[PDB]
Amino acid sequence: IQMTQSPSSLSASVGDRVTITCRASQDVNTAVAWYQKKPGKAPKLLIYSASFLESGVPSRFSGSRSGTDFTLTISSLQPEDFATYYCQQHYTTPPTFGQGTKVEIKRTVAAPSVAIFPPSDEQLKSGTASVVCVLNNFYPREAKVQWKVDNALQSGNSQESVTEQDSKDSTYALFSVLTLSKADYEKHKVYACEVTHQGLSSPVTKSFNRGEC
Amino acid sequence: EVQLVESGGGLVQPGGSLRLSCAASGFNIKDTYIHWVREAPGKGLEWVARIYPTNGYTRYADSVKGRFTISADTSKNTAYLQMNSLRAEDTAVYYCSRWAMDYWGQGTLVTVSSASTKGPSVFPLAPSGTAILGCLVKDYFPEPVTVSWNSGALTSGVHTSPAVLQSSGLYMLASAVTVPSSSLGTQTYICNVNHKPSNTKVDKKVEP
């Protein structure tokens, strides 16, 4: 029995009405539970037997069934409700889970601050050069970082990582790393990170000159 | 209060064996079913096995039948997952739960890999109103690494990225913090990096 869960993710403000759906591939009667999972934390049971609120869990959470379709509703989103939600059928063995729904907190657009860092003296001594671009305190998550070396657009030699939403202001941070051998690094002068974002009226570039203090 | 605590996780060679334990408190496992559920990177939640400790009856997911064994010792109020012929696909956080699954443990991490432990190099991201400075934590295995600033005294504004797997099969992450520009010539900033799997602790001073 399959559990198809929609949507994969959603943004919402405190007080909103949020709806998550799960469709079983076949009948599972009312044998359905909803779980909340926060990163690095144990799954927590919210709703059992499709419609019943687990003792202790806030009243805003509710579940419903109609045929093969199951719906998890949060009537009024409180700040601590930010998490990932999973449906589960336990009608047959094996019990199976939905792919999850990540609920994130909606906020006003914020442009990223940008910083660029040359490789450390220490790393260069080892024969490798990691150039790093940091994007801070921005929203929404979608951002484009574009490495340029002597105005030559780079491809397939950087990796990036984005943080989860900040606890206090709900922004993201992004780290982008361009790693070159010391030999390749020293064949070029100007290293640049170009940032495109919704909060930027035009792409922002930070750059440095190789070797300048 | 009902509690479940998993242990036994760690780094294991493919084809090897590893035994996880799930210690129960505040209830007797004789009265319930105990389950193992796992969360492999990007695979969601996957049920692994269940046992009824009173009669020892067991069920398994098809993917682990035969090569995993779940068991229980009621006199220890503890259940177990014996994992054999371990595969890369078995790399996951393993949770215990009981019967809806109303209580879960915090999980225990299992990493199935032929790679050796390796501690990170830690490199400064040195500062050029406000300023950003940080550290780059590069070339470690396995996850996880923890990062603090000034031995935990500096928390506000600290942002630490998830790890990235490099083409070399080694992890890297970075952490950055925004500080007052006026603080730069006088306030000491140190990133404290711990990598328990290799017993590596590095405290790196970041200077302008």
PDB file of C-alpha atoms in Angstrom, chain B residues 42-169:
ATOM      1  CA  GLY B  42      16.879  11.496   0.995  1.00  0.00           C
ATOM      2  CA  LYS B  43      14.843   8.286   1.206  1.00  0.00           C
ATOM      3  CA  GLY B  44      12.291   9.389   3.803  1.00  0.00           C
ATOM      4  CA  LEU B  45      11.124   7.067   6.588  1.00  0.00           C
ATOM      5  CA  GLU B  46      11.273   3.287   6.038  1.00  0.00           C
ATOM      6  CA  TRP B  47      10.001   0.615   8.376  1.00  0.00           C
ATOM      7  CA  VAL B  48      12.554  -2.153   8.929  1.00  0.00           C
ATOM      8  CA  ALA B  49      11.180  -4.749  11.346  1.00  0.00           C
ATOM      9  CA  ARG B  50       8.821  -5.363  14.247  1.00  0.00           C
ATOM     10  CA  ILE B  51       8.746  -7.756  17.191  1.00  0.00           C
ATOM     11  CA  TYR B  52       6.181  -8.774  19.789  1.00  0.00           C
ATOM     12  CA  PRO B  53       8.387  -9.554  22.775  1.00  0.00           C
ATOM     13  CA  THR B  54       5.843 -11.727  24.586  1.00  0.00           C
ATOM     14  CA  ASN B  55       6.000 -14.479  21.945  1.00  0.00           C
ATOM     15  CA  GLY B  56       8.990 -13.348  19.912  1.00  0.00           C
ATOM     16  CA  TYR B  57       6.975 -13.095  16.696  1.00  0.00           C
ATOM     17  CA  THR B  58       8.715 -10.958  14.097  1.00  0.00           C
ATOM     18  CA  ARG B  59       8.083  -9.266  10.746  1.00  0.00           C
ATOM     19  CA  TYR B  60      10.579  -7.734   8.313  1.00  0.00           C
ATOM     20  CA  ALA B  61      10.782  -5.428   5.359  1.00  0.00           C
ATOM     21  CA  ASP B  62      11.580  -7.352   2.162  1.00  0.00           C
ATOM     22  CA  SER B  63      14.857  -5.470   1.737  1.00  0.00           C
ATOM     23  CA  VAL B  64      16.319  -6.780   4.987  1.00  0.00           C
ATOM     24  CA  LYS B  65      14.636 -10.170   5.400  1.00  0.00           C
ATOM     25  CA  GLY B  66      17.111 -12.949   6.135  1.00  0.00           C
ATOM     26  CA  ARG B  67      20.080 -10.716   6.755  1.00  0.00           C
ATOM     27  CA  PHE B  68      18.626  -8.662   9.624  1.00  0.00           C
ATOM     28  CA  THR B  69      17.254 -10.188  12.839  1.00  0.00           C
ATOM     29  CA  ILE B  70      15.155  -8.320  15.397  1.00  0.00           C
ATOM     30  CA  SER B  71      14.987  -9.777  18.917  1.00  0.00           C
ATOM     31  CA  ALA B  72      14.105  -8.807  22.448  1.00  0.00           C
ATOM     32  CA  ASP B  73      15.014  -9.557  26.021  1.00  0.00           C
ATOM     33  CA  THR B  74      12.075  -8.769  28.255  1.00  0.00           C
ATOM     34  CA  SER B  75      14.170  -9.207  31.415  1.00  0.00           C
ATOM     35  CA  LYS B  76      16.280  -6.315  30.102  1.00  0.00           C
ATOM     36  CA  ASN B  77      13.305  -4.386  28.704  1.00  0.00           C
ATOM     37  CA  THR B  78      15.529  -4.057  25.658  1.00  0.00           C
ATOM     38  CA  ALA B  79      15.088  -4.891  21.963  1.00  0.00           C
ATOM     39  CA  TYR B  80      17.826  -5.425  19.380  1.00  0.00           C
ATOM     40  CA  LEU B  81      18.493  -5.236  15.694  1.00  0.00           C
ATOM     41  CA  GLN B  82      21.215  -7.551  14.426  1.00  0.00           C
ATOM     42  CA  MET B  83      22.292  -6.300  11.024  1.00  0.00           C
ATOM     43  CA  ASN B  84      24.322  -8.573   8.722  1.00  0.00           C
ATOM     44  CA  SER B  85      25.662  -8.409   5.150  1.00  0.00           C
ATOM     45  CA  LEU B  86      25.575  -4.650   5.489  1.00  0.00           C
ATOM     46  CA  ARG B  87      25.151  -2.581   2.310  1.00  0.00           C
ATOM     47  CA  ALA B  88      25.639   1.091   1.457  1.00  0.00           C
ATOM     48  CA  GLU B  89      21.843   1.357   1.214  1.00  0.00           C
ATOM     49  CA  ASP B  90      21.693   0.489   4.941  1.00  0.00           C
ATOM     50  CA  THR B  91      23.409   3.743   5.852  1.00  0.00           C
ATOM     51  CA  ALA B  92      20.728   5.584   7.839  1.00  0.00           C
ATOM     52  CA  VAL B  93      19.606   6.960  11.164  1.00  0.00           C
ATOM     53  CA  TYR B  94      17.929   3.997  12.937  1.00  0.00           C
ATOM     54  CA  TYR B  95      15.014   4.704  15.243  1.00  0.00           C
ATOM     55  CA  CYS B  96      13.211   2.444  17.630  1.00  0.00           C
ATOM     56  CA  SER B  97       9.492   2.922  18.287  1.00  0.00           C
ATOM     57  CA  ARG B  98       6.593   1.168  19.992  1.00  0.00           C
ATOM     58  CA  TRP B  99       2.960   0.463  19.288  1.00  0.00           C
ATOM     59  CA  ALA B 100       0.165   4.392  15.977  1.00  0.00           C
ATOM     60  CA  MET B 101       3.820   4.753  16.929  1.00  0.00           C
ATOM     61  CA  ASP B 102       3.357   7.025  19.933  1.00  0.00           C
ATOM     62  CA  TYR B 103       6.949   7.056  21.184  1.00  0.00           C
ATOM     63  CA  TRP B 104      10.296   7.039  19.339  1.00  0.00           C
ATOM     64  CA  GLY B 105      13.954   7.191  20.356  1.00  0.00           C
ATOM     65  CA  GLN B 106      16.320   9.947  19.164  1.00  0.00           C
ATOM     66  CA  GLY B 107      17.962   7.534  16.736  1.00  0.00           C
ATOM     67  CA  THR B 108      21.416   6.059  16.201  1.00  0.00           C
ATOM     68  CA  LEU B 109      23.514   6.668  13.099  1.00  0.00           C
ATOM     69  CA  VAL B 110      24.831   3.763  11.060  1.00  0.00           C
ATOM     70  CA  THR B 111      27.335   4.401   8.245  1.00  0.00           C
ATOM     71  CA  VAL B 112      28.239   1.549   5.919  1.00  0.00           C
ATOM     72  CA  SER B 113      31.488   2.458   4.181  1.00  0.00           C
ATOM     73  CA  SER B 114      34.911   1.087   3.282  1.00  0.00           C
ATOM     74  CA  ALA B 115      36.418   4.556   3.860  1.00  0.00           C
ATOM     75  CA  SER B 116      38.777   5.271   6.765  1.00  0.00           C
ATOM     76  CA  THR B 117      38.063   7.816   9.466  1.00  0.00           C
ATOM     77  CA  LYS B 118      39.774  11.144   8.736  1.00  0.00           C
ATOM     78  CA  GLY B 119      39.757  14.357  10.764  1.00  0.00           C
ATOM     79  CA  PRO B 120      39.078  17.727   9.141  1.00  0.00           C
ATOM     80  CA  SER B 121      41.457  20.487   8.188  1.00  0.00           C
ATOM     81  CA  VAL B 122      40.156  23.794   9.529  1.00  0.00           C
ATOM     82  CA  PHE B 123      40.865  26.965   7.589  1.00  0.00           C
ATOM     83  CA  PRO B 124      40.003  30.533   8.442  1.00  0.00           C
ATOM     84  CA  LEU B 125      37.648  32.722   6.452  1.00  0.00           C
ATOM     85  CA  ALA B 126      39.313  35.953   7.460  1.00  0.00           C
ATOM     86  CA  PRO B 127      37.467  39.301   7.546  1.00  0.00           C
ATOM     87  CA  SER B 128      38.295  41.624   4.657  1.00  0.00           C
ATOM     88  CA  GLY B 129      29.057  48.450  10.258  1.00  0.00           C
ATOM     89  CA  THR B 130      29.151  44.655  10.171  1.00  0.00           C
ATOM     90  CA  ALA B 131      31.562  42.025   8.841  1.00  0.00           C
ATOM     91  CA  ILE B 132      31.398  38.334   8.079  1.00  0.00           C
ATOM     92  CA  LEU B 133      34.111  35.945   9.189  1.00  0.00           C
ATOM     93  CA  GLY B 134      34.159  32.164   9.448  1.00  0.00           C
ATOM     94  CA  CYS B 135      35.857  28.827   9.114  1.00  0.00           C
ATOM     95  CA  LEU B 136      36.022  26.212   6.396  1.00  0.00           C
ATOM     96  CA  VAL B 137      35.950  22.639   7.706  1.00  0.00           C
ATOM     97  CA  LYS B 138      37.362  20.467   4.971  1.00  0.00           C
ATOM     98  CA  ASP B 139      38.166  16.812   4.193  1.00  0.00           C
ATOM     99  CA  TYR B 140      36.654  14.682   6.951  1.00  0.00           C
ATOM    100  CA  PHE B 141      34.893  11.348   7.144  1.00  0.00           C
ATOM    101  CA  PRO B 142      32.375  10.301   8.346  1.00  0.00           C
ATOM    102  CA  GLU B 143      29.790  12.824   9.392  1.00  0.00           C
ATOM    103  CA  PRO B 144      29.239  14.531  11.775  1.00  0.00           C
ATOM    104  CA  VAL B 145      31.276  17.573  12.695  1.00  0.00           C
ATOM    105  CA  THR B 146      30.147  20.107  15.302  1.00  0.00           C
ATOM    106  CA  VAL B 147      31.148  23.762  15.184  1.00  0.00           C
ATOM    107  CA  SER B 148      30.981  26.383  17.906  1.00  0.00           C
ATOM    108  CA  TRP B 149      32.421  29.885  18.268  1.00  0.00           C
ATOM    109  CA  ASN B 150      34.498  31.154  21.195  1.00  0.00           C
ATOM    110  CA  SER B 151      33.781  27.939  23.076  1.00  0.00           C
ATOM    111  CA  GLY B 152      30.029  28.524  22.855  1.00  0.00           C
ATOM    112  CA  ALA B 153      30.025  32.126  24.052  1.00  0.00           C
ATOM    113  CA  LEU B 154      29.148  33.398  20.571  1.00  0.00           C
ATOM    114  CA  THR B 155      25.842  31.994  19.249  1.00  0.00           C
ATOM    115  CA  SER B 156      23.843  34.915  17.797  1.00  0.00           C
ATOM    116  CA  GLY B 157      24.195  35.195  14.021  1.00  0.00           C
ATOM    117  CA  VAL B 158      26.219  31.988  13.677  1.00  0.00           C
ATOM    118  CA  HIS B 159      25.290  30.036  10.574  1.00  0.00           C
ATOM    119  CA  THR B 160      26.754  26.640   9.835  1.00  0.00           C
ATOM    120  CA  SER B 161      26.089  24.870   6.569  1.00  0.00           C
ATOM    121  CA  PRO B 162      25.135  21.226   6.100  1.00  0.00           C
ATOM    122  CA  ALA B 163      28.037  19.113   4.940  1.00  0.00           C
ATOM    123  CA  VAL B 164      28.801  18.688   1.282  1.00  0.00           C
ATOM    124  CA  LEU B 165      30.298  15.484  -0.098  1.00  0.00           C
ATOM    125  CA  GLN B 166      33.264  16.351  -2.305  1.00  0.00           C
ATOM    126  CA  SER B 167      34.300  14.393  -5.352  1.00  0.00           C
ATOM    127  CA  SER B 168      37.022  12.802  -3.197  1.00  0.00           C
ATOM    128  CA  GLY B 169      34.405  11.174  -0.962  1.00  0.00           C
TER     129      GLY B 169
END
